[PDB]
């Protein structure tokens, strides 16, 4: 039967699962988030198209349950993201990865990035004058760091983080940590 | 045409690309590494059987150049792993992600983990008595941890890391950093 194009899709599985780590270039991260977002409705439409064209009755076996589940699990996450956007109008709340945001007050501007999980201690490494707090490339900085950053969820829980202690390594590199000190419920 | 099974394949692009990273669960990480390793043999055989069955001449236009590429790359990425195993015999060098290892001398034994990149400064957080150095869950430890660790490449490189300074947070949490101090070429 058909073996070429179906095999070629397996090569994409090595493009993924190996390059999903991409957090160095911001453009790559944005393109990956966009790909993960626009792929959510595409996979639903194909399931419904397979379900409507009744063949061998398998379209009503698992092909109607699959589409229904992938729709009911999409609606809830979209409304949760809408709630997070309503709390903080940051436009990052519609990412398909997580519903926790991190705000970092750099020089004159505030940078918002998605956060996988909110914890008590957050690290910061400034290798060769290139700040990277939570694995996120935040730009170019030095040891002049901001002594207060913020983590925003949607169900209350505005967490304020304070600069613990910063050390300098090898001239221009460094390390620092932020520890939580205040919680404010919406 | 065929819509059900191929659409069901698009669901795997959300299970992967979203859950594929250096997650805390070591069993899941080993499972992901095993899946990544088992992937490569398939594409060779699949392309072999897609090119031998000459149909519409497409089996020679692209089914042999891509197969040759994916066959010649596997040999290099296998011989490099065998060289790294020759340097250090730890069985972790065969992972298809990276050829850099991190050795951490915990209580009694030594723990080896893959390392994406060797850097000058390495952080560590001990949230709620759960050590995690480079994003890898190393088990349960305290603030009284090891003052020397190593990073092993294969290109005649062994880097020694020395404990810079450790701080305690909220009773049983804390953070620490390691800075490189010696390089030894094999």
């Amino acid at each position, epitope marked *: 039967q058909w073996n070429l194009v179906i095999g070629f899709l397996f090569l994409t599985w090595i493009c993924l699962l190996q390059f999903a780590y991409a957090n160095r270039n911001r453009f790559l991260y944005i393109i990956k988030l966009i790909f993960l977002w626009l792929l959510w409705p595409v996979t639903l439409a194909c399931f419904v198209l397979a379900a409507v064209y009744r063949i061998n009755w398998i379209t009503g076996g698992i092909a109607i349950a699959m589409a229904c589940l992938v729709g009911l699990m999409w609606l809830s996450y979209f409304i949760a993201s809408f709630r997070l956007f309503a709390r903080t109008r940051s436009m990052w709340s519609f990412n398909p990865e997580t519903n926790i945001l991190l705000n970092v007050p750099l020089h004159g501007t505030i940078l918002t990035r998605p956060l996988l999980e909110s914890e008590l201690v957050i690290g910061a490494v400034i290798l060769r004058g290139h700040l990277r707090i939570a694995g996120h490339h935040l730009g170019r900085c030095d040891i002049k760091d*901001l002594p*207060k950053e913020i983590t925003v969820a949607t169900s209350r829980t505005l967490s304020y983080y304070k600069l613990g202690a910063s050390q300098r390594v090898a001239g221009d590199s460094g390390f620092a940590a932020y520890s*939580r*000190y205040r919680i404010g419920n919406y | 045409q065929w819509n059900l099974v191929i659409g069901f394949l698009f669901l795997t692009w959300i299970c992967l690309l979203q859950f594929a990273y250096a997650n805390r669960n070591r069993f899941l990480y080993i499972i992901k590494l095993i899946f990544l390793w088992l992937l490569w043999p398939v594409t060779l055989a699949c392309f072999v059987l897609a090119a031998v069955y000459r149909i519409n001449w497409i089996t020679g236009g692209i089914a042999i150049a891509m197969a040759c590429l994916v066959g010649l790359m596997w040999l290099s990425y296998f011989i490099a792993s065998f060289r790294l195993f020759a340097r250090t015999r730890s069985m972790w060098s065969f992972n298809p992600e990276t050829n850099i290892l991190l050795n951490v001398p915990l209580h009694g034994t030594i723990l080896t983990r893959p390392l994406l990149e060797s850097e000058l400064v390495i952080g560590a957080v001990i949230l709620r008595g759960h050590l995690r150095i480079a994003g890898h869950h190393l088990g349960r430890c305290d603030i009284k941890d090891l003052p020397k660790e190593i990073t092993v490449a294969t290109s005649r490189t062994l880097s020694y890391y020395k404990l810079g300074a450790s701080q305690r947070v*909220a009773g049983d949490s804390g953070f620490a950093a390691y800075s490189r101090y010696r390089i030894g070429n094999y």
Partner: antibody, heavy 113, light 112 residues
Framework: EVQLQQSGPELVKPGASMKISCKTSGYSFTGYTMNWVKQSHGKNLEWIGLINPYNGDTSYNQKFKGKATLTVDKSSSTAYMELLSLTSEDSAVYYC??????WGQGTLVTVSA | DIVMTQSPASLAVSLGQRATISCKASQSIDYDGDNYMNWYQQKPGQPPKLLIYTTSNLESGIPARFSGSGSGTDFTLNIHPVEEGDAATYYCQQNNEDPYTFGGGTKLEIKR
């Protein structure tokens, strides 16, 4: 070297209003939270509210709502808490802080006719 | 509604001896698995000074003679090498809910 400088002691007739200033220096004005604290009738302290300079988002407590109003002027880096309908029980010292570590000098308010 | 009651009203301690203050919470200031609690020192004519900001973690530049401890609803502050330069008043704050309630205060007097 974060520094906060307040307005100064003021005398207000009962029933009037007052505006207090907390001009800041040494850091980028937007980024902190600028809590306001009140110390009255000796040595007991109370919390009034906070406000995010980047975009509004004031937050009070259920006791000082309708009595204090906080604004922000990003051009000159000042905070402008204002009290309304002052009475005899409104004379105290008002502080402004950022990260609970850097405080203002204080502002004595005397409400008497 | 989380009124905190520290009830040494005044306390006298000689040089070198150890002094303790026993601010206690009302019901449940232990959210998120950790207890948040600030300790302040205020001298006459100055704004309050932060010492300890989460039941622990003495602020940068503060001498190590101050130690904070406690859990549940009972918290303590300890100054073991009581010197002559600390004759201030000490406060406790919760930093957990909408009303960030302060403590009553405890005036530290030095015996001589």
């Amino acid at each position: 070297e974060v520094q906060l400088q307040q307005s100064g002691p003021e005398l207000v007739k009962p029933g009037a209003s007052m505006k207090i200033s907390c001009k800041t220096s040494g850091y980028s004005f937007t980024g902190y939270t600028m809590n306001w604290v009140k110390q009255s009738h000796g040595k007991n302290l109370e919390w009034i509210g906070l406000i995010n300079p980047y975009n509004g988002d004031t937050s009070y407590n259920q006791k000082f709502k309708g009595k204090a109003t906080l604004t922000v002027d990003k051009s000159s880096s000042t905070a402008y808490m204002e009290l309304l309908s002052l009475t005899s029980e409104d004379s105290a010292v008002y502080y402004c802080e950022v990260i609970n570590t850097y405080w203002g000098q204080g502002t004595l308010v005397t409400v008497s006719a | 509604d989380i009124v905190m009651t520290q009830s040494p009203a005044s306390l006298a301690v000689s040089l070198g001896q150890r002094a303790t203050i026993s601010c206690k919470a009302s019901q449940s200031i232990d959210y998120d698995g950790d207890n948040y609690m600030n300790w302040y020192q205020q001298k006459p004519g100055q704004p309050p000074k932060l010492l300890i900001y989460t039941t622990s973690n003495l602020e940068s530049g503060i001498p190590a003679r101050f130690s904070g401890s406690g859990s549940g609803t009972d918290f303590t502050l300890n100054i073991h090498p009581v010197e002559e330069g600390d004759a201030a008043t000490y406060y406790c704050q919760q930093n957990n809910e909408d009303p960030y309630t302060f403590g009553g205060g405890t005036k530290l007097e030095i015996k001589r």
